[PDB]
Amino acid sequence: MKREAIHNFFVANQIIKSTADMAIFDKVPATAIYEVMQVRQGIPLFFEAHLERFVMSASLVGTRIPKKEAEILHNIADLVEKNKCDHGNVKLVSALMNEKEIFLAYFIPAEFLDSKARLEGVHTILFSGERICPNIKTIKGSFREQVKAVRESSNAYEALLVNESGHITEGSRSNVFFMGKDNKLYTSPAGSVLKGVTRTHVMQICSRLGLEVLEKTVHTRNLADIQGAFITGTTVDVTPVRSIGNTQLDSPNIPLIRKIVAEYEKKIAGYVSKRLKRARKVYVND
């Protein structure tokens, strides 16, 4: 695990440390459970969704998350305050073993979807690898380091992971979806992937919208029969895919891909604005 926090301060178990003192990163084991959230205008985005995964992952694995809801909010709010920053990505790491508990909360670098990428969609590549404890967002679980070199010398915004069996699972930080030659929606199924928050939103939207998403094992060879792809995820929203290694797609020109994108943006805006509205009613009759 790298000394990965940005800005000036992070949290380490209810103490605010400065990012000039990052040694605690070294003590973090690969079994640590994490979460990433967007902060937008000081609102941790889909907090309830993330904490439910965080808590429920812990519980199912057989640890505990050391901190209750109210405290995690307090930690995020101090990172926002101490860092003089109300937008970016926040990471929460949890590890506990009988006394020896480590909870970290901190900003990491944000992606910026360039011009090219916004109109064309993103370049992506294939990476051969499968995630240990894939149902769980763990340190062990993260492909990020594995795929650094590759991604850069590629201009690829995501490395899509490939099994033994030559199925495309998920992105290193994203769920992937596919539009059939057929115009049916495909994603790799639940049990081969991380149950993404945003995956879940996309599923719900598709379903409001009336295209069912067919959960389905997708091979390397199936790339011929695919007209579009998108990637989902906290750090990447719903991003159109222009290309997968060599296979060009024209994902931004499928009317449905665009529809989902926008549908998601709406959800974010309405989440944030619900919150900020409440806070303000609360400032008003103070």
Author numbering: 1 to 286
What did the published study say regarding this structure?
Here, we describe a monomeric PLP-dependent fold type IV transaminase found in a marine aromatic-compound-degrading sulfate-reducing bacterium Desulfobacula toluolica Tol2. The new monomeric transaminase (DtolTA) is stereoselective and active toward D-alanine and (R)-phenylethylamine. The results show that the active site of the transaminase, formed by a single subunit, is active in PLP-catalyzed deamination but is insufficient for double-substrate transamination.
As part of the subunit had no electron density in the high-resolution structure, the low-resolution structure was used to describe the overall structure, while the high-resolution structure was used to describe the active site of DtolTA. A total of 30 residues at the N-terminus and 9 residues at the C-terminus had no electron density in DtolTA (high resolution), while in DtolTA (low resolution), the entire polypeptide chain was clearly visible. According to the crystallographic contacts, DtolTA is a monomer, and no functional dimer similar to bsDATA was found in the crystal cell based on contact analysis. Similarly to the known transaminases of PLP fold type IV, the subunit of DtolTA consists of two α/β domains: a small domain (residues 1–107) and a large domain (residues 122–286) connected by the interdomain loop (residues 108–121). The DtolTA monomer is distinguished by the O-pocket loop (residues 97–100), which is significantly shorter than that in bsDAAT (residues 92–110), the C-terminal α-helix (residues 256–286), which is approximately twice as large as that in bsDATA (residues 263–277), and, finally, by the unique position of the O-pocket α-helix (residues 22–27). In addition, in DtolTA, the position of α-helix 22–27 was reinforced by the salt bridge Asp26–Arg3. Other structural elements involved in the formation of the dimer interface in bsDATA, eBCAT, and R-ATA have the same spatial arrangement as in DtolTA.
